[PDB]
């Protein structure tokens, strides 16, 4: 039913920025908070922050606040997240999620 489509992978150059997309479909885009989660093979899951589509209100992890920016595009029902000054430590799988539904994730590889 609900679907949070994320592109499979992203190859990025060290020190640059990356824009990750998350297209929601099958439910009212504005009534549910969208969270962004980071996953690196070695460690657990890490919450980056969230955004409420209706008014773009955001909460960020103190660890990721200036490093990431969260926005939405209510007309296309897409949520975006941008990371800058990328380094090897940012290579991981990033997932966008809402209650009960996680996207497939996007593998960001800095090389």
């Amino acid at each position: 039913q609900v679907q949070l489509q994320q592109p499979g992978a992203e190859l990025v150059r060290p020190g640059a920025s990356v824009k990750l997309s998350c297209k929601a479909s099958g439910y009212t885009f504005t009534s549910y908070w969208i969270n962004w989660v980071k996953q690196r093979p070695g460690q657990g899951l890490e919450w980056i922050g969230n955004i409420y589509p209706s008014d773009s209100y955001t909460n960020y992890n103190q660890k990721f606040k200036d490093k990431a920016t969260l926005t939405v595009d209510k007309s296309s029902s897409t949520a975006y997240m941008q990371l800058s000054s990328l380094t090897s430590e940012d290579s991981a799988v990033y997932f966008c999620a809402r209650w009960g539904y996680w996207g497939q994730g996007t593998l960001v590889t800095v090389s």
């Binding site: 969270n35 657990g44 899951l45 919450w47 992890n61 660890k63 999620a97 996680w102 497939q104």
Partner: protein, 106 residues
């Protein structure tokens, strides 16, 4: 910053057995705890929320329990399809945090 410490990193067992994974919070989170199941190369799947409520689709085999600071995930009759990673998450206050995970192997 609420820390979530899962008992073990790995746990062995074979089909038929009963397993219990524990999650201890460093602060009281009432019952605002969720458990996820994650198989390799896939995204996490919600199992339990509000400490003991089963989500639409999870089998009666899974049972959550606890409150305050001690939570537990219980699989009464471990089937092969249950071999995977299990995470607990807190959603009472920011930042939202997860446990390190517990791998279920044969």
């Amino acid at each position: 910053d609420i820390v979530l410490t899962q008992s073990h990193k790995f746990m062995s067992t074979s089909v038929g057995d009963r397993v219990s994974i524990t999650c201890k919070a460093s602060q009281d989170v009432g019952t605002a705890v969720a458990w996820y199941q994650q198989k390799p190369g896939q995204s996490p799947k919600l199992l339990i929320y509000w400490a003991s409520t089963r989500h639409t689709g999870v089998p009666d085999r899974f049972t959550g329990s606890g409150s305050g600071t001690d939570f537990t995930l219980t699989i009464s009759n471990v089937q092969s399809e249950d071999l995977a990673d299990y995470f607990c998450q807190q959603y009472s206050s920011y930042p939202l945090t997860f446990g390190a995970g517990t791998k279920l192997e044969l």
